[PDB]
Amino acid sequence: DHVRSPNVSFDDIDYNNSQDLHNAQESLLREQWIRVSALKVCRKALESCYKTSGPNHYEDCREIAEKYLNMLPDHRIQGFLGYQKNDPSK
């Protein structure tokens, strides 16, 4: 039916086991589309708030717009090759 995301961080696996490495790539992707969807819902509130408030949209939608701009830069598909082929700890 609705198959879930097999949460597997790259740091737990050895890339030699190809079946595991596939899981860590798929899991990182499926957690990135959820963030984009949560961006759409957040922006779906900003549109409704802006219209209903009218002239008040600078105060009745202040936090919603502020959160949307804060989350915009990093709520987009980034891919797994960025974190698979890099180790941030070094």
């Binding site: 509130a45 409704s48 708030c49 209903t52 939608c61 936090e63 919603i64 502020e66 959160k67």
Partner: protein
């Protein structure tokens, strides 16, 4: 008047003052079709249209910011 060779040139619009012999017969045949289409647009239009300022009341929005604050 003159000859414009409309014998073989048969565009979708006729061209060079073209009017078919049975133009009255097809005239209502389109009014019947066109009027039905507009009725479809009025039935589709009213069913699906909405007011974007009334879908969400003011109380619901006044709490959304408190969640995202």
């Amino acid at each position: 008047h003159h000859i414009h060779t409309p014998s073989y040139i048969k565009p979708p619009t006729g061209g060079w003052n073209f009017t078919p012999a049975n133009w009255k017969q097809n005239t209502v045949l389109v009014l019947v079709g066109f009027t039905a289409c507009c009725v479809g647009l009025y039935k589709l239009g009213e069913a699906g249209s909405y007011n974007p300022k009334l879908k969400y009341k003011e109380e619901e929005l006044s709490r959304w910011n408190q969640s995202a604050k």
